[PDB]
Design a protein around this ligand. Structure first.
Ligand SMILES: [Ca+2]
Lengths: 50, 163, 38, 442, 419
């Protein structure tokens, strides 16, 4: 399993709090720090669709 | 006495010396239509006829031989093979023939008297003097001779000096 | 049966289309084979 | 029973031999090697591919002065350019005339196609030859995979076989190996760190899925054109592409002894060099007493056909008078001929036709039929085909193709000279004794 | 599922960038080519451009279209009006995001072009496209038939694989059109629903930002005194060298690329079979290639002496085959192995001028050496025996010739030729 971030709160990278089609400007900030992260691919796949 | 005079009368015309810058080192022999002349004596033949020829060689017997022409074959030496033991005539006197060996008493013998034939009481050549070796008081000769079969036998004692 | 080029979908008549042409709403293969199960 | 033999290392050609325990019937052994491998110990060092120059976006400040920041990327070049006046699509980017500043940044990273298109630099030592044998010990067959070291036997039905060590430690692989695109190249690559630009090794990487890559690609940042935004660079073209253009042919085309260089384990197959000794430990339950087998008397051999050919160019007939009807083994213990048959079924009376292959122009070999020994003697004739497509089924000898005419012209001119010189010596001795004998009288 | 890999490029943008040859001079072209990677075999290239592919101008997923920026605003055309060519025309297969897949012959450059209005857009970049054949036989267009070998072409699909490219925030794009004039003033009018930042240097120093407010400035009474930028916050652009970068070091993410290289199967041509003639320890080859074809030969012995030659015209290649083997590879054909056997010119069973030539064409060095040493031994023996014969004849006749009688006996006359 992999825990992604948006603040100092860990969540599983398959269940994001936000989506691109809901809030577009903040998903890029969500994908900012999560590049040096083994679950960037799962985070992007979960941010693809709701 | 008279033996040397008989040697000088028999060997007057038939004996020719060998010259080498004025030095007499050897003597050839004209017998049987053949010209005997040794190897170690080197020089020119004093005779004009015998010098302008070609002599076949025999280094083992120590003899050079040639063919005397027909106009001189009658004026040669005589030769024979029948020889008993005892005394024979030589240019410096007498020579003893004992046990098939020629012996000369001492006092005579130097470098130059090589090729002198040995004569008998009749006038026939029985041997040709080639070398000599000093044996005690009485020296021995290294010579050549013939036999009844017709084979030229060369007799040579131990440690001879060529003359 | 697969195609040769590693990203192709294969029609009913053997013809190979690109892999994203399978369910695209536009008729690509004869008899609409790619558009049958979408 | 202990039995040791020596098979030449060459696959495809059969090898026959028989065990002769004294009071028992001879047992035929036929072993045909299917495949002979050579697997070296192979240690990966680094992989290489095309590079991909990553160009960072130009940071522009209007009437200011940028500063260079290090990022410790591979072969990372950084330079700052002043006095630039950039243009976008919608007009000028600054308002100043001078004092504008722009950072160009570039670095070398691996290509996007590395997982499929790359090469691997290895190292080789300590090969282990491994073989596939098809063994027939007393009309019973098995396919067997055996290791040729001084241990590791195989066991079937009580029979124990130990392939002895190869006579030669030769390998077609050198110290350093490059595997690219299924083929194997015998290249001398630089070490991990000695990679020079323009040649093989300018990009290095410990594994394909590694993270730390060496790059020495001679990267130099140039000045951007007046009135434009770009990062200009100038570096040496790729070492991997240049290696691909300047390849020698692979090791499956240039290796000696007919090696076949295969890929997926790095190996060479069916490479005919050296000889493989064998050893047997046969149980006594597979043997048979002599009296239960056909023992024969009064056998004679005549040669029907004799052609010194690569295949079985000889036909010979053995006329025998045995005691019972059955099979027995046939074998030539010498190296003159090689039998095809290795088992001839006999009646109580008749003739037996066997097939051999020889290289002697005048063969004379001592054939073993069931427990006896006959002598086959004939003359062979040359073949007419100049080139064949199969290898040579026998073993050549010195003085093998010498004819009886050639022996005559050697002997009558080489010993006849000795006869002439010794009769010259005897003639000279008789002449010397005769001439010395006539000189004894005086 | 299909959208599952298209929505990642749904969150980026297209952009404009600088081209060199854009049909008159140089300009900012909406189809600026970033890279052309051409390592697939049968002619498949994978461009990377500025405009995107397979998406709708509003942001939906339309089938075969291309989506390009045009001075800030985003347009689209169907993909069958986009054409490109290297030396001869190419054929677009598909596209996904910034990446187009094409099929092209070799050339020095690529010109991608279309024509929206009666205004032709182009971009030429000097990037070499190369055509890479499979196998030992070098062709330019793949054959109608042959055999199938392992090849590596760019995969037509678009699946998630190991490769990623990084998309960042766009920079502040400047806009001259955005600045304007009142009667005597300078007015900055942002577009609809759009923030901007304005920087002017006419009086003191001004850095201001608007959010959808048409602001009149009282000072700075020239257009050139003010630069009007534009603000983008919900979109990405590629990390390109042709775009200024935004303040802050955030890269914000990365996307995987379509059309990577994979393992496929390609039909390679098959050469005409040679005409093989044999000689004594020799094989001759008559070779009639259609297209140029490598010939690889080697020996099966300790020294291979291999040969490698790209043959393109009709050729005749006489080789030497010993009793240790020989092997040729012609084209994509398998290796044919040949082996020699003992057929020398001559009869080994008599007539001694024939056995010498037989054992000379069989073994050239040993025959010369053996005949030389046998002739030397025979010569020394005959000369020594004749020498001893002359020595014994001299030793017989020397005692009999020195005698003055000069006779020869009966036995030693005829037996020694004495006369
Ligand atoms: Ca379709």
């Amino acid at each position: 399993t992999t825990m992604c971030l948006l603040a100092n709160v860990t969540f599983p990278c398959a269940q994001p709090p936000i989506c691109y089609d809901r809030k577009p400007a903040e998903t890029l900030a969500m994908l900012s720090v999560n590049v040096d992260n083994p679950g960037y691919d799962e985070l992007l796949e979960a941010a693809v669709k709701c | 006495g008279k033996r040397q005079r008989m040697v000088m009368k028999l060997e007057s015309d038939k004996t020719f010396p060998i010259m080498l810058e004025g030095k007499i080192n050897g003597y050839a022999c004209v017998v049987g239509g053949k010209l005997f002349r040794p190897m170690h004596v080197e020089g020119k033949i004093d005779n004009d006829v015998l010098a302008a020829l070609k002599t076949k060689k025999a280094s083992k017997y120590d003899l050079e031989y040639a063919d005397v022409p027909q106009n001189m074959r009658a004026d040669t030496f005589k030769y024979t093979h029948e020889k008993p033991q005892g005394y024979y005539s030589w240019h410096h006197g007498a020579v003893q023939y004992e046990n098939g060996r020629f012996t000369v008493p001492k006092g005579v013998g130097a470098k130059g008297d090589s090729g002198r034939p040995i004569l008998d009481n009749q006038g026939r050549v029985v041997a040709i003097v080639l070398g000599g070796v000093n044996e005690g008081s009485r020296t021995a000769l290294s010579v050549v001779m013939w036999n009844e079969k017709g084979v030229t036998v060369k007799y040579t004692p131990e440690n001879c000096e060529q003359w | 049966n697969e195609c040769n080029i590693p990203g192709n979908f294969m029609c009913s008549n053997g013809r190979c289309i690109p892999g994203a042409w399978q369910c695209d709403g536009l008729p690509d293969c004869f008899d609409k084979s790619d558009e049958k199960e979408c | 029973y202990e039995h040791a033999t020596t098979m030449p290392s060459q696959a495809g050609i059969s090898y026959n031999t028989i065990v002769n325990r004294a009071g028992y019937a001879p047992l035929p052994i036929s072993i045909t090697p299917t495949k002979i491998k050579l697997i070296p110990t192979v240690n990966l060092e680094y992989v290489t591919c095309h590079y991909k120059t990553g160009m960072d976006s130009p940071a522009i400040k209007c009437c200011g002065s940028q500063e260079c920041t290090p990022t410790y990327r591979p072969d990372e070049q950084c330079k700052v350019f002043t006095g630039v006046y950039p243009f976008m699509w919608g007009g000028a980017y600054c308002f100043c005339d001078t004092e504008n500043t722009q950072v160009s940044k570039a670095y070398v990273m691996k290509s996007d196609d590395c997982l499929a298109d790359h090469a691997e630099a290895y190292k080789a030592h300590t090969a282990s030859v491994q073989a596939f044998l098809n063994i027939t010990v007393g009309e019973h067959s098995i396919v067997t995979t055996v290791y040729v070291n001084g241990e590791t036997p195989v066991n079937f039905n009580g029979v124990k076989i130990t392939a002895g060590p190869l006579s030669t430690a030769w390998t077609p692989f050198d110290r350093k190996i490059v595997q690219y695109a299924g083929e194997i190249y015998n290249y001398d690559f630089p070490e991990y760190g000695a990679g020079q630009p323009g040649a093989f090794g300018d990009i290095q990487s410990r594994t394909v899925s590694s993270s730390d890559l060496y790059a020495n690609t001679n990267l130099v940042l140039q000045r951007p054109k007046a009135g434009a935004i770009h990062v200009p660079y100038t570096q040496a073209p790729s070492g991997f592409e240049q290696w691909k253009k300047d390849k020698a042919p692979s090791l499956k085309f240039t290796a000696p002894f007919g090696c076949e260089i295969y890929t997926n384990p790095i190996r060479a197959e069916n490479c005919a060099v050296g000889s493989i000794p064998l050893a047997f430990d046969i149980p006594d339950a597979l043997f048979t007493r002599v009296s239960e087998t056909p023992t024969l008397s009064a056998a004679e051999c005549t040669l029907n056909e004799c052609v010194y050919s690569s295949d079985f160019g000889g036909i010979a007939t053995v006329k025998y008078s045995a005691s019972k009807s059955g099979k027995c083994a046939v074998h030539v213990p010498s190296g003159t001929a090689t039998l095809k048959e290795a088992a001839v079924e006999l009646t109580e009376q008749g003739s037996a036709t066997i097939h051999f292959s020889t290289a002697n122009i005048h063969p004379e070999f001592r054939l073993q039929i069931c427990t006896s020994y006959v002598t086959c003697k004939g003359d062979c004739h040359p073949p007419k085909d100049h080139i064949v497509t199969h290898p040579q089924y026998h073993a050549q000898t010195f003085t093998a193709a010498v004819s009886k005419t050639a022996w005559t012209w050697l002997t009558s001119l080489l010993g006849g000279s000795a006869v002439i010189i010794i009769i010259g010596l005897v003639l000279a001795t008789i002449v010397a004794m005769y001439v010395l004998t006539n000189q004894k009288h005086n | 599922s299909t959208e599952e890999l298209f929505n990642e490029y749904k969150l980026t943008r297209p952009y404009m960038a600088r081209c060199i040859r854009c049909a008159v001079g140089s300009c900012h072209s909406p189809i600026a080519i970033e890279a052309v990677k051409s390592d697939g075999h049968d002619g498949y290239v994978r461009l990377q451009t500025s405009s995107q592919y397979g998406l709708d101008s509003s942001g939906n997923l339309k089938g075969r279209t291309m989506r390009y920026d045009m001075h800030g605003t985003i347009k689209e055309i169907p993909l069958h009006q986009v054409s490109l060519y290297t030396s001869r025309p190419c054929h677009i297969v598909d596209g996904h995001g910034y990446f187009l897949l094409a099929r092209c012959p070799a050339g020095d450059s690529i010109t991608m072009e279309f024509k929206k209005d009666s205004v032709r857009h182009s971009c030429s970049v000097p990037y070499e496209v190369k055509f890479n054949p499979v196998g030992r036989e070098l062709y330019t267009h793949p054959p109608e038939h042959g055999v199938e070998q392992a090849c590596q072409v760019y995969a037509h699909d678009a699946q998630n694989r190991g490769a990623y490219v990084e998309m960042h925030l766009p920079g502040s794009e400047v806009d001259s059109s955005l600045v304007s004039l009142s009667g005597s003033s300078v007015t900055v009018t942002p577009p609809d629903g759009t923030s901007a930042l304005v920087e002017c240097e006419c009086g003191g120093t001004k850095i201001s930002e608007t959010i959808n407010k048409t602001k009149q400035f009282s000072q700075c009474t020239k257009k050139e005194q003010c630069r009007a930028y534009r603000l983008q916050n919900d979109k990405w652009v590629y990390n390109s060298d042709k775009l200024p970068k935004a303040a802050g070091a955030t890269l914000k993410g990365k996307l995987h690329v379509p059309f990577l290289l994979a393992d496929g199967k390609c039909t390679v041509p098959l050469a005409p079979e040679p005409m093989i003639t044999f000689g004594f320890r020799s094989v001759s080859l008559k070779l009639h290639p259609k297209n140029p074809t490598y010939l690889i030969t080697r020996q099966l012995a300790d020294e291979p002496h291999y040969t490698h030659e790209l043959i393109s015209e009709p050729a005749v290649r006489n080789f030497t085959v010993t009793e240790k083997g020989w092997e040729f590879v012609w084209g994509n054909h398998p290796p044919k192995r040949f082996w020699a056997q003992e057929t020398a010119p001559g009869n080994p069973h008599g007539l001694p001028h024939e056995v010498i030539t037989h054992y000379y064409h069989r073994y050239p060095m040993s025959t010369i050496l053996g005949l030389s040493i046998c002739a030397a031994i025979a010569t020394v023996s005959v000369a020594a025996s004749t020498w001893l014969f002359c020595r014994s004849r001299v030793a017989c006749l020397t005692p009999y010739r020195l005698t003055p009688n000069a006779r020869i006996p009966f036995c030693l006359a005829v037996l020694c030729c004495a006369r």
